[PDB]
Design an enzyme around this catalytic site. Structure first.
Site, PDB file in Angstrom:
ATOM      1  N   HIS B  46       0.801  -1.113  -0.291  1.00 38.60           N
ATOM      2  CA  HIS B  46      -0.227  -0.026   0.002  1.00 38.60           C
ATOM      3  C   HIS B  46       0.550   1.257   0.157  1.00 38.60           C
ATOM      4  O   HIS B  46       1.664   1.523   0.622  1.00 38.60           O
ATOM      5  CB  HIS B  46      -0.683   0.168   1.344  1.00 38.60           C
ATOM      6  CG  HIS B  46      -1.989  -0.800   1.748  1.00 38.60           C
ATOM      7  ND1 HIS B  46      -1.498  -1.408   2.657  1.00 38.60           N
ATOM      8  CD2 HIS B  46      -2.669  -1.835   0.590  1.00 38.60           C
ATOM      9  CE1 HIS B  46      -2.431  -2.606   2.864  1.00 38.60           C
ATOM     10  NE2 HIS B  46      -2.941  -2.690   2.106  1.00 38.60           N
ATOM     11  N   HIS B  48       1.009   4.463   1.718  1.00 44.18           N
ATOM     12  CA  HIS B  48      -0.138   5.709   2.691  1.00 44.18           C
ATOM     13  C   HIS B  48       0.761   6.033   3.022  1.00 44.18           C
ATOM     14  O   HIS B  48       0.922   7.471   2.290  1.00 44.18           O
ATOM     15  CB  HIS B  48       1.289   4.217   4.662  1.00 44.18           C
ATOM     16  CG  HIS B  48       0.401   3.372   4.543  1.00 44.18           C
ATOM     17  ND1 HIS B  48      -0.409   3.238   5.836  1.00 44.18           N
ATOM     18  CD2 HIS B  48       0.264   2.300   3.991  1.00 44.18           C
ATOM     19  CE1 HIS B  48      -0.722   1.659   6.117  1.00 44.18           C
ATOM     20  NE2 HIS B  48      -0.021   0.787   5.016  1.00 44.18           N
ATOM     21  N   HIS B  63      -4.243   4.685   5.421  1.00 39.89           N
ATOM     22  CA  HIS B  63      -3.582   4.533   3.779  1.00 39.89           C
ATOM     23  C   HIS B  63      -3.927   5.824   3.543  1.00 39.89           C
ATOM     24  O   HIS B  63      -4.936   5.903   3.281  1.00 39.89           O
ATOM     25  CB  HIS B  63      -4.880   3.457   2.766  1.00 39.89           C
ATOM     26  CG  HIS B  63      -4.881   1.665   3.663  1.00 39.89           C
ATOM     27  ND1 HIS B  63      -5.351   0.925   3.114  1.00 39.89           N
ATOM     28  CD2 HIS B  63      -3.969   1.487   4.350  1.00 39.89           C
ATOM     29  CE1 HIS B  63      -5.007  -0.358   3.210  1.00 39.89           C
ATOM     30  NE2 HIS B  63      -4.101   0.308   4.550  1.00 39.89           N
ATOM     31  N   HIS B  71     -11.514   0.785   1.593  1.00 37.51           N
ATOM     32  CA  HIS B  71     -10.273  -0.178   1.354  1.00 37.51           C
ATOM     33  C   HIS B  71     -11.467  -1.178   0.210  1.00 37.51           C
ATOM     34  O   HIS B  71     -12.241  -1.812  -0.121  1.00 37.51           O
ATOM     35  CB  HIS B  71      -9.900  -0.654   2.810  1.00 37.51           C
ATOM     36  CG  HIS B  71      -8.469  -1.650   2.239  1.00 37.51           C
ATOM     37  ND1 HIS B  71      -7.618  -1.255   1.844  1.00 37.51           N
ATOM     38  CD2 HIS B  71      -8.899  -2.791   2.268  1.00 37.51           C
ATOM     39  CE1 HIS B  71      -7.103  -1.811   1.738  1.00 37.51           C
ATOM     40  NE2 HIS B  71      -7.156  -3.022   1.515  1.00 37.51           N
ATOM     41  N   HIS B  80      -9.357   2.570  -1.872  1.00 38.28           N
ATOM     42  CA  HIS B  80      -8.262   3.678  -1.603  1.00 38.28           C
ATOM     43  C   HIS B  80      -6.971   4.081  -2.883  1.00 38.28           C
ATOM     44  O   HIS B  80      -7.009   2.939  -3.633  1.00 38.28           O
ATOM     45  CB  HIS B  80      -7.928   4.106   0.202  1.00 38.28           C
ATOM     46  CG  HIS B  80      -8.956   3.213   1.016  1.00 38.28           C
ATOM     47  ND1 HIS B  80      -8.423   2.411   1.766  1.00 38.28           N
ATOM     48  CD2 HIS B  80      -9.484   4.369   0.994  1.00 38.28           C
ATOM     49  CE1 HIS B  80      -9.059   2.654   2.785  1.00 38.28           C
ATOM     50  NE2 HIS B  80     -10.104   3.156   2.089  1.00 38.28           N
ATOM     51  N   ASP B  83      -4.658   1.832  -2.311  1.00 36.58           N
ATOM     52  CA  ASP B  83      -4.497   0.433  -2.208  1.00 36.58           C
ATOM     53  C   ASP B  83      -4.049  -0.612  -3.412  1.00 36.58           C
ATOM     54  O   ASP B  83      -4.627  -0.677  -4.714  1.00 36.58           O
ATOM     55  CB  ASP B  83      -6.030  -0.040  -2.379  1.00 36.58           C
ATOM     56  CG  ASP B  83      -6.728  -0.185  -1.156  1.00 36.58           C
ATOM     57  OD1 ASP B  83      -6.012   0.693  -0.303  1.00 36.58           O
ATOM     58  OD2 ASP B  83      -7.790   0.527  -0.734  1.00 36.58           O
ATOM     59  N   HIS B 120       4.018  -5.406   3.568  1.00 32.93           N
ATOM     60  CA  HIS B 120       2.876  -6.144   5.765  1.00 32.93           C
ATOM     61  C   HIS B 120       2.557  -7.008   5.441  1.00 32.93           C
ATOM     62  O   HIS B 120       3.512  -7.817   4.469  1.00 32.93           O
ATOM     63  CB  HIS B 120       1.362  -5.969   5.643  1.00 32.93           C
ATOM     64  CG  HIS B 120       0.962  -4.113   5.327  1.00 32.93           C
ATOM     65  ND1 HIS B 120       0.002  -3.961   6.540  1.00 32.93           N
ATOM     66  CD2 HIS B 120       1.231  -3.659   4.087  1.00 32.93           C
ATOM     67  CE1 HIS B 120       0.219  -3.336   6.541  1.00 32.93           C
ATOM     68  NE2 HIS B 120       0.185  -2.056   5.269  1.00 32.93           N
ATOM     69  N   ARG B 143       3.823  -3.988   9.442  1.00 28.85           N
ATOM     70  CA  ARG B 143       4.197  -3.240   8.766  1.00 28.85           C
ATOM     71  C   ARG B 143       5.868  -3.640   8.517  1.00 28.85           C
ATOM     72  O   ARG B 143       6.773  -3.671   9.819  1.00 28.85           O
ATOM     73  CB  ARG B 143       4.162  -1.519   8.747  1.00 28.85           C
ATOM     74  CG  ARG B 143       2.997  -1.631   8.766  1.00 28.85           C
ATOM     75  CD  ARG B 143       2.665   0.041   8.448  1.00 28.85           C
ATOM     76  NE  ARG B 143       1.217   0.587   9.324  1.00 28.85           N
ATOM     77  CZ  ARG B 143       0.876   2.152   9.473  1.00 28.85           C
ATOM     78  NH1 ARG B 143       1.841   3.098   8.537  1.00 28.85           N
ATOM     79  NH2 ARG B 143      -0.387   2.026   9.449  1.00 28.85           N
TER      80      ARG B 143
HETATM   81 CU   LIG Z   1       0.139  -0.650   3.830  1.00 26.34          CU
HETATM   82 ZN   LIG Z   2      -6.526   0.355   1.503  1.00 31.78          ZN
END
Ligand SMILES: [Cu+2]
Ligand SMILES: [Zn+2]
Ligand SMILES: [Zn+2]
Ligand SMILES: [Zn+2]
Lengths: 153, 153
Positions: B46, B48, B63, B71, B80, B83, B120, B143
């Site tokens: 992702h 962020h 995010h 999401h 998002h 994403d 992640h 993370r």
């Molecule tokens: Cu993430």
């Molecule tokens: Zn997201």
């Protein structure tokens, strides 16, 4: 009302956190924070063109110079946008950074977000060194630590 | 910018380099590179919101979601901006990343320069998890590594 941050890392450890704040797009950027692990005295401090740290600080390329000018100090009209002069470290190796600069920005074409902040081994001679390199790099020597400038809350 | 790069690092063995390229304004962004040190299988991936790594990857915030959507996965309309789904590691722990995405951008309001790319611990469930966190985070867990997305040459 726009904020940025950079974590500087390099061998020593040379390390610090530098914050950036610009209250309006037509205003100056305040730059402040602390860097540890430095030799006592002045150290060149610049925004470099690329936010690429794949092979360390060397990957950041030259000074950020969107107008194709010569290297100078922060007070000069002839300077690179990335020319922030020197920071000063005390006997304990800590530099307390406090700069206001009207040439860098956190938005628009002089935006430094996504570029690399670098602190150097030697002082930047501000283009006054009278050799070829002075008006390119300021003779500030090796890159001791760097980080990519990121958007902050 | 037309190119960007991110060096992913964390507290453990996960590291990599991810490249970004956008040939045309508002056109697709190619995302490619390699990440090592991962467990075999899918790992959420992702952008962020903040490019802040002052306390490691936690500092990057939520995010990247400028449009205030739920999401989802990269092939969903409801997602998002940040994403990018999952990357897949093999038994050796290596994920070869190759994505094209047209929601992220390297300019304008959807710009990801100066934000943080995060990989992640767990797979992202893409919003299909049927708990409340699914449509916020995707349940991807910890993370493992992150970096600020910088301008590349
Ligand atoms: Cu993430
Ligand atoms: Zn997201
Ligand atoms: Zn420099
Ligand atoms: Zn310069």
């Amino acid at each position: 009302a726009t904020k940025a941050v950079c974590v500087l890392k390099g061998d020593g450890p040379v390390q610090g956190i530098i914050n950036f704040e610009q209250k309006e797009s037509n205003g100056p950027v305040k730059v402040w924070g602390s860097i540890k692990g430095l030799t006592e005295g002045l150290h060149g401090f610049h925004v470099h063109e690329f936010g690429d740290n794949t092979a360390g600080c060397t990957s950041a390329g030259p000074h950020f110079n969107p107008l194709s000018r010569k290297h100078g100090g922060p007070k000069d009209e002839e300077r690179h946008v990335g020319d922030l002069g020197n920071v000063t470290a005390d006997k304990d190796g800590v530099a307390d950074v406090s700069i206001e600069d009207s040439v860098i920005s956190l938005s628009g074409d002089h935006c430094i977000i996504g570029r690399t902040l670098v602190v150097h081994e030697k002082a930047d001679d501000l283009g006054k060194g009278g050799n070829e390199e002075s008006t390119k790099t300021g003779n500030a020597g090796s890159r001791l630590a760097c980080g990519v400038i990121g958007i902050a809350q």
